[PDB]
């Protein structure tokens, strides 16, 4: 027997800035979004689902300096919470 499934489901994309806008990369420290993402994943994978972690990353960018950017979550079809359960 055959059954129908949604063609697109359980995706989440996380981009380094909003549409039209730049993202920053330090020549020795690396991309600011990437560094910030790693720090938040390390700190929060244990307690927060991925959507919540991405929100926290966005919050960390909130007060703009001379090199501003606002990461954006896009095209989200997660139907459940995605916990990484690090160590398991």
């Amino acid at each position: 027997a055959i059954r129908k499934a949604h063609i697109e489901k359980d995706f989440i994309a996380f981009c380094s800035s909003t549409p039209d806008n730049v993202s920053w990369r330090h020549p020795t420290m690396g991309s600011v979004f990437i560094g910030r993402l790693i720090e938040h994943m390390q700190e929060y994978a244990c307690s927060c689902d991925v959507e919540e972690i991405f929100r926290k990353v966005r919050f960390s960018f909130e007060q703009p300096d001379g090199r501003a950017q606002m990461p954006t979550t896009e095209r989200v079809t997660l139907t459940r919470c995605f916990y990484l359960f690090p160590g398991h």
Binding site: A5, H6, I7, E8, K9, D10, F11, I12, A13, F14, C15, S16, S17, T18, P19, D20, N21, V22, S23, R25, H26, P27, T28, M29, G30, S31, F33, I34, G35, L37, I38, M41, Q42, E43, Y44, A45, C46, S47, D49, V50, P64, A68, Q69, M70, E74, R75, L78, R80, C81, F82, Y83, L84, F85, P86, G87, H88
Partner: protein
């Protein structure tokens, strides 16, 4: 200790894990048995280009993301300096990997120069664009083109400009 497989990633204790399964009942993605699962991740990073400035510091990003994804339990393929065409080929190959059938999730990470339209391939120029659209990424990983990842979270991370604008406005303080 950071000497373990999880490195600098803080561990979820059994006490934390069971509390998480209490706060949210049947609304968490299932994780497969650690002993048998085969989690895959892909990192595509373009650092050296034909026409556009070299992305100095990209190696720091590759190192950081590779180690993080390994810490989280993923076997990471790293591909460097690809045309949009090559990226498409690599993504299709990734979608066809048999390990996804015995995996519970995936991460895809793209790092490059970008424009409003999408992500730049190594050959990109204003005269002859070499662009991979986010839309193509989703299509290659969906249930039609990647049935092995049906019902499993697919996390796409993109480091790239999305245009030329500084992304700011002034307000009176």
């Amino acid at each position: 200790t950071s000497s373990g497989s999880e490195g600098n990633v803080k561990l979820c204790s059994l006490e934390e894990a069971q509390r998480i399964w209490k706060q949210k009942s049947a609304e968490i993605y299932p994780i497969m048995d650690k002993s048998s699962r085969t989690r895959l991740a892909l990192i595509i990073c373009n650092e050296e280009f034909d026409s556009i400035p070299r992305r100095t510091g990209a190696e720091v990003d590759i190192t950081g993301m590779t180690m993080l994804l390994q810490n989280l339990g993923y076997s990471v393929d790293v591909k460097k300096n690809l045309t949009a065409s090559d990226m498409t080929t690599e993504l299709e190959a990734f979608a066809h990997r048999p390990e996804h059938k015995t995996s519970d999730s995936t991460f895809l990470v793209f790092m490059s120069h970008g424009i409003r339209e999408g992500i730049c391939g190594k050959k990109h120029s204003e005269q002859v664009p070499d662009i991979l659209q986010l839309n193509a990424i989703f299509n290659m990983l969906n249930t039609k083109n990647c049935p092995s990842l049906k019902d499993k979270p697919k996390v796409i991370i993109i480091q790239a400009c999305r245009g030329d604008s500084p992304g700011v406005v002034w307000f009176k303080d």
